Subunit: 224 residues, 3 copies
């Protein structure tokens, strides 16, 4: 029944899903060590650290392609869409916002939708790298990987923003779960582009997103 | 009497004022902790650290706009104009140069003129961001702020140049005086170009520069 | 006998010599402190650290000229030509690869040919900076120097890749031998393109390459 994958490919991420990636990234950034004290004594550094979690994919993909990183800041609709979630995750009265979204079902849905935004970011970078370099496989893998787990790769300098400098925790030394999955996804969809992978994009799109959501759901379920 | 602000808007900064910003930035870089030993044992690192104080506004504004940072190095007239001040601040015979400009009236004039160069840098980055992005308010604020206090934002990596690594002293954690004033100035003049602020450009230019020079003059006076 | 310098001005570096620079850079990167443990437990970090040694010249010259650093990754022939040397230097059976190239005559030839690749990289960056900026001397010096000893200037962040952070060992504080030689070469050949240096390009090319190979051969001979 390939008619269902065609319906899944018509999804738009501007309203609902972009907020889910921004919320899951800001909440996961708050749950990190010493992030509450940053927002309590320095809202500017905690906000910029949240933007590195939300738009880290577009920032790294722009720096690697010699594209202006301020161009991501031009979309005032998206920047304000993530800043409002940041202010509510940290500075909501009675912390009713975080306590509501920390609930297990709501946290599963929000995180699972961020996994969906990761897919289109990978394909965005792969097709965008194709616009700059035609059949260069390594460029498309790099930019698609840069948009999939951008915040995970700038995580070393993102830690430097909040104040913690950990030179021993490099992403290439121990590839974390999201970064290595984005690497696998970037390679697969580059072969999907490259036509070396015998499957349509939309079917590979659906099965990779499902294989990603199912794992993180299982992780968040087996963790609590 | 708005006829005086029109006369003030006609200042050219190429001869006198650019040297004032370069001198105030190089001298303030020397007075930092452990800067004399850098120039005495490694003139290369102290010179580059001085260039990050002088041209830090243009460097950060070029990196944010994907513009070549080496383009700032193209103006050999400006680079030599700051390197000559660097060599005289550190390596002048009998230190007659620094001892002359460390005098309170001369230090007040040189620093007060750097406050004037900060204004045109803010407006240069706001109008330059307007050339790249029409009515994007956040881009004009970012680039105008990047040229106002550029050396203050790269201060973390500028410290890494001389050899001091302070991951705890982030500019976003505690906003210093010059950086936060440039932020206020970048926001005000951005509302001016967007015509959201009910005042002419020339008058807002003059009152902001005066409000800036008067504060630093008061600071340098109340400090000695 | 200027008839021999013309025959030398004609070496093509695509087959033999590019592998020599990649081999000498990867082997010298392995001989660094704690580099074997990186490749044994984190092949991704050791590979990227090896690429920063091989293509650090092109990477830094691209970042300084606002050119896409991923553009160096487009040449899959050159990237695979260096990654194969990386895998054989580290993961060859019985380490027969490193033990063969660590032999003194073979190590002298491989390192001496990397010194030849350094020459064309300096001239590549000088002529490339001439294409972006006509008679800008400082830009031609910077880019030619950026291609000559690129891995030596990103060495601070390259150390951050493998996991070691030394904020005290800056290249400008104590200029190493290869970096300061590339600076001298970048200045000499910049005076050549500007015709301020009374010598033909081909002759200055040959005498500078010989003066560089003879020194490193003497160093490797007096070190063992």
């Amino acid at each position: 029944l390939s008619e269902v994958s065609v319906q899944f490919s018509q999804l738009s991420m501007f309203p609902f899903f972009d907020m889910a990636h921004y919320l899951a990234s800001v909440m996961s950034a708050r749950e990190q060590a010493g992030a509450l004290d940053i927002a309590s004594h320095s809202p500017m550094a905690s906000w910029f650290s949240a933007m590195l979690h939300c738009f880290g994919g577009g920032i790294l993909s722009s720096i690697l392609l010699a594209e202006p990183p301020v161009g991501i800041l031009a979309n005032t609709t998206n920047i304000m869409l993530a800043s409002a979630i940041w202010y509510m995750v940290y500075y909501f009265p009675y912390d009713l916002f975080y306590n509501c979204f920390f609930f297990l079902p709501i946290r599963l849905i929000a995180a699972g939708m961020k996994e969906v935004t990761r897919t289109w970011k990978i394909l965005s970078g792969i097709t965008h790298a194709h616009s700059h370099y035609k059949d260069a496989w390594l460029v498309m893998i790099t930019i698609g990987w840069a948009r999939g787990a951008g915040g995970g790769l700038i995580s070393n300098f993102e830690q430097l923003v909040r104040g913690v400098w950990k030179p021993e925790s490099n992403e290439f030394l121990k590839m974390s779960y999201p970064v290595k999955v984005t690497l696998i996804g970037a390679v697969l969809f580059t072969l999907q582009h490259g036509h070396y992978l015998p499957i349509s994009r939309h079917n590979l799109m659906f099965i990779y997103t499902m294989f990603l959501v199912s794992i993180k759901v299982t992780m968040m379920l087996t963790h609590s």
